[PDB]
Design a protein around this ligand. Sequence first.
Ligand SMILES: N#CCc1cccc(NC(=O)N2CCC[C@H](C(N)=O)C2)c1
Ligand SMILES: [Zn+2]
Length: 140
Amino acid sequence: SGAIYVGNYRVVNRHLATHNDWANLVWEDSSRDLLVSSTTAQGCDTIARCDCQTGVYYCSSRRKHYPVSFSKPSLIFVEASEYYPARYQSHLMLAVGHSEPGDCGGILRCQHGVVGIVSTGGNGLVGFADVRDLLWLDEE
Ligand SMILES: N#CCc1cccc(NC(=O)N2CCC[C@H](C(N)=O)C2)c1
Ligand SMILES: [Zn+2]
């Protein structure tokens, strides 16, 4: 589990969105595994606006933050799970690192701010849903 809290937005994995998220919906995209809902309180996270390929992510199944090198956001085939059939996920970045299903939502960050959240995993790989292109998270 986990979310990004930027401005009056809450960014979560679409597959982990709650009823309150769907009832306060701003934007959702199943191909990216992302959903954004509105919040009453202002958050403290800031979004990175860069092309870094190195950063640090939080792994809840280890209670640890790990430094990683990650690929650029791309269209990647992801195996079937309880939440989606086997399909292509867009804006996904891969790295070598530990991930279990419940690690989804952990933040990946670079020197500029939050880069994305854990969205995929298995066999020593971890995948992150990028948010750096969502410029509207910084306003309104
Ligand atoms: N190998 C292995 C098992 C394993 C370990 C660790 C994680 C996973 N699960 C996943 O990657 N996802 C399940 C939630 C939905 C995700 C999505 N964005 O489509 C895909 C699977
Ligand atoms: Zn950066």
